[PDB]
Amino acid sequence: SMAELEHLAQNISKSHLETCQYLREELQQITWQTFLQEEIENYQNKQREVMWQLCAIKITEAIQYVVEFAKRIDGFMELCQNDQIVLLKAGSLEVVFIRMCRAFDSQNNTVYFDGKYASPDVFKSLGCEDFISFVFEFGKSLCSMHLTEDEIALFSAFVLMSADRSWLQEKVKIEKLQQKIQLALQHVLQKNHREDGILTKLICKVSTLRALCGRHTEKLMAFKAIYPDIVRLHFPPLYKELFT
């Protein structure tokens, strides 16, 4: 029913609001708060492996909030333990990239990182300007859609509840929850007087998201293959656990 979709949206909306690290309006307010050239050069002087470790810390902190986001979605908690893990392994970073759009300046192509808005040049030492460019591209694209917090919440829940992840056990139950989340997202988008082409634009973004996470995975696994002791000893346990 319509009431059931409204309740579902409220559950997911409140879970998101409770588990976002920063208020949307606060992030949007301080886009003028940018790294100075001296600060940029400081990051650029870091060796590749050190810059990566710093970035993994930030990613992992974001992921801890996403784990809590998932835990407060009633439909997610109803799933078996195996499927919860499978979904979070495959989907947590996707949610992080969606959440990035809340902390992105689409006009100036900057992202809120380590306390200030950073250009791609901040990430120079990672040695993968193509990947970084792709990340900023996704951010700029999503951030320019001006999604509300509730729309971001439902879109986040939608990608997390992907019934097509490998190794899932309760495929049917997850499919049901995902379909209902998508109907709720459609409803909210319409209510906010979005054109009907809004949702199909978002669905297209899902492919981009998986490609992004795909790159991150292959980069990390290559790093682990050459530098196994660095990964084992210096990267966050949750990070190693989710992605390696």
Binding site: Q64, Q81, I85, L238
Partner: peptide, 9 residues
């Protein structure tokens, strides 16, 4: 494991 812990499994 750590994920299992955080999920309360």
């Amino acid at each position: 494991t750590l994920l299992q812990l955080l999920l309360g499994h």
